[PDB]
Amino acid sequence: GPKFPRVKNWELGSITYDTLCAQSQQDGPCTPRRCLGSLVLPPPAEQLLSQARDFINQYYSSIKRSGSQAHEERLQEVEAEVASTGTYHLRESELVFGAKQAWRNAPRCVGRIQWGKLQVFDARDCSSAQEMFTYICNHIKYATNRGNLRSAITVFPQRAPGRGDFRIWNSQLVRYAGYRQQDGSVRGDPANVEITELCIQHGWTPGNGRFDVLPLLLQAPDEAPELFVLPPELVLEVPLEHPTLEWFAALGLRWYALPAVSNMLLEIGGLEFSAAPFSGWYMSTEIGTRNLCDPHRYNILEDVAVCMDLDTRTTSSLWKDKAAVEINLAVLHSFQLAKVTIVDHHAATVSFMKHLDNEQKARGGCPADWAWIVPPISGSLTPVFHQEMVNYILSPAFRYQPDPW
Amino acid sequence: KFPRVKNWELGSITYDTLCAQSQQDGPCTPRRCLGSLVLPRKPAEQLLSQARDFINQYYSSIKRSGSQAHEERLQEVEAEVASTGTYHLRESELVFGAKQAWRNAPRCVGRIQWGKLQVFDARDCSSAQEMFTYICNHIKYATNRGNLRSAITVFPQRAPGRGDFRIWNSQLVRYAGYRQQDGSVRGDPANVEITELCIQHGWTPGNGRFDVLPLLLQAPDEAPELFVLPPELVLEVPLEHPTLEWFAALGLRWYALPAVSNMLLEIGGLEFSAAPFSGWYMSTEIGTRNLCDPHRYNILEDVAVCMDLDTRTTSSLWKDKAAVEINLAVLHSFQLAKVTIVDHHAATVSFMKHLDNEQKARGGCPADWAWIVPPISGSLTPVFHQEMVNYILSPAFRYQPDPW
């Protein structure tokens, strides 16, 4: 009946329609001819204004004052501002609403049940790389909270017409060095080879461990990036052990507590915040399956399977599945032991299902990228697998941005 | 223009140029992607253009494009459509068409095998009774005492103003699902509706968890007829576990032959509403989806208790542990019974080989990432890290409405 995507859950047999996608002002990569949903990565004052008006409309709706005197006055204020300067500025509460809505709108994020609980640090007064470092350290301290993790975003000044960007060169605030070896192999995290080599070019004295924490390359406008070593006590790490396999601890594996994405662009009302690092807490599969078992990452699956004495010479022994499970268990157990917030893929996906129901009632839908939402192990054992999802771009949004170099 | 397709594990990049040969729209639009949806929401120059396209594919396949045999065949098809509103395929064209349809099936991880398909031409079928004979021979051939062989049997095409030949069952082998009035379901909950149709049409029900259903076969514009499959035709594999001796006591089993029977085969604009096809199982289909899905046999918690796992909390990964054991039991039992099966690692490795073969042969391969990536241990397989492009090529298998 309804002229909107019909969405089905195959476990429960329930149907919803997504009307929210009607609100999308930006095209994704798919066409009637071919779907490109699996691909990881596929102003004019008039353009700014319509985007700004849309956002201001969203803001006043969220506080139930659409059509009010203050709404019309803010609209007029923004138009005038853009008319004279080419850009405009957000009120503080507008920035808070926008950062939250950006998270709420992120189709690839399974942790959105928490979207309303986001501490927004306004750092739009920052004027140097040293100062970015102070704000980032404060962020890490607040967000880590000795293991009782709290979601947070720090927002640095927006892109300015005829001025260089604030940029954090690292993809995350915490990253392990990846050292290319003479034999062609990599020691540490191969995901971080390029950033490691950039840190070295910029004057970092490199270690040679598998778990060397990288320094931050921080770039204030129209300046070369400066290098900052995070004080070790600020970086909470968790040594990995297994509840029953006593030898697992002898592997010397570990991971850091705080997942803090630092290279993404936060777009609100046409304004672009090129440095706006945000953090939450880990879902256990990100560490145990992806970071530790991806072939192009630490790739420890074989090492663990050999320690567990599995038949690694045949696929049908399911040695990969067995080792991956014990590695995930080790991550969960070790985080719980060290009293550091973490969520397993079952608890996380159940909570995302609750989020979908919440959003269905609040907004008539929820943009969700199925391939990213379904966990990388045990997919169909979690409820999201059986949930059809509609993917589309709403704004405010977090977006990819080209690397500064 | 053409999509840049990247493998994230290897760093390699291809360009899909095959997608431009798509003449059929999928469900996505630039505003929103609907790739995770299971089913679709919903003159004679049209037919002729699809007919000519297919005949062009066929003669190109035998390296005879432009030849007189080619030109004469296009005239035959055109003459027949102009006069009758339709046309018929030659057997060899049908064999080609069925293979291309499997080849083009974006949800199928087993396409490395596409060129090896036994095609039974059953277009001289005039009755439900005859359909049953063809189906029995298909099952006999395909099962081959456990040395499974891919096969398809093709029944008469749809014709204007005449009911379709249909097999009402979604698969040739299906376990009954009996809805007990105590809310629950005995047997396979996926098959409640079909089990009920069978009863209504006069089948005497069982009361077991693995009662093999009769086939409901429909010749055009007639009520469907009921046919019990000879038990000796339906090979089944008792499930046991190599190291957990208690597992066999669960009384679990599954059938050998996965034979889909309710899909439409479209070739050159002609539609074949009954064209059951079978290959062999990938172990996760049985172990993970059929036995562990919550809305199927849902045995996870049973196995976990028997493994004495901490069921209290998700963080113990009891589900993940029990699921691995069940999949292992499936592989072990099929291997012991000498019945063909493939695990999800071997299957996805062979699929990557297939993507590479197809890239060279056709400049692309339609693949539905959500279906290709196995339901457990996704990122542990190479396909997880492979970007894929989904689109509809013809010949194709399609969904069609249930005939009731």
Ligand code: HEM
């Ligand atoms: C609070 C706990 C959180 C959890 C458990 C969580 C979980 C996840 C996971 C598992 C992913 C997939 C990433 C991958 O596999 O590569 C993801 C992506 C993402 N998350 Fe969340 N997240 C949380 C908090 C946040 C916060 C606070 C923000 C921003 C305010 C956020 C924004 C995003 C965005 C923009 C992506 C997509 C980035 C990409 O394309 O890789 N998340 N999240």
Ligand code: HEM
């Ligand atoms: C030879 C061994 C084969 C294997 C291991 C295999 C494997 C699979 C798997 C795992 C799926 C996903 C279905 C699901 O998730 O439930 C699938 C789907 C499919 N297969 Fe294959 N297959 C094989 C042979 C064949 C053959 C012979 C044909 C046709 C001639 C075929 C056509 C299809 C089609 C059309 C689908 C999509 C089903 C749907 O949309 O519901 N397959 N296959």
Ligand SMILES: Cc1cc(N)nc(CCc2cncc(N3CCN(C)CC3)c2)c1
């Ligand atoms: C706040 C947050 C919490 C969490 N548990 N996971 C994440 C995602 C981490 C993550 C993993 N892989 C890739 C990315 N993105 C980062 C942005 N980058 C531009 C692309 C890769 C991000 C973020």
Ligand SMILES: Cc1cc(N)nc(CCc2cncc(N3CCN(C)CC3)c2)c1
């Ligand atoms: C040839 C073949 C081999 C194999 N191992 N699995 C299959 C998939 C069986 C299968 C699983 N789930 C769903 C479907 N379809 C059947 C067609 N039906 C219309 C929808 C559900 C089919 C087919």
Ligand SMILES: C[C@H](O)[C@H](O)[C@H]1CNc2nc(N)[nH]c(=O)c2N1
């Ligand atoms: C090719 C494929 O899109 C790619 O490997 C995706 C799949 N799903 C994912 N899902 C999450 N959560 N994170 C990822 O990095 C990916 N990678």
Ligand SMILES: C[C@H](O)[C@H](O)[C@H]1CNc2nc(N)[nH]c(=O)c2N1
């Ligand atoms: C909603 C979601 O698309 C649905 O559960 C899909 C996901 N991927 C799948 N993949 C395969 N191979 N088979 C399936 O039935 C499904 N189901």
Ligand SMILES: [Zn+2]
């Ligand atoms: Zn799509």
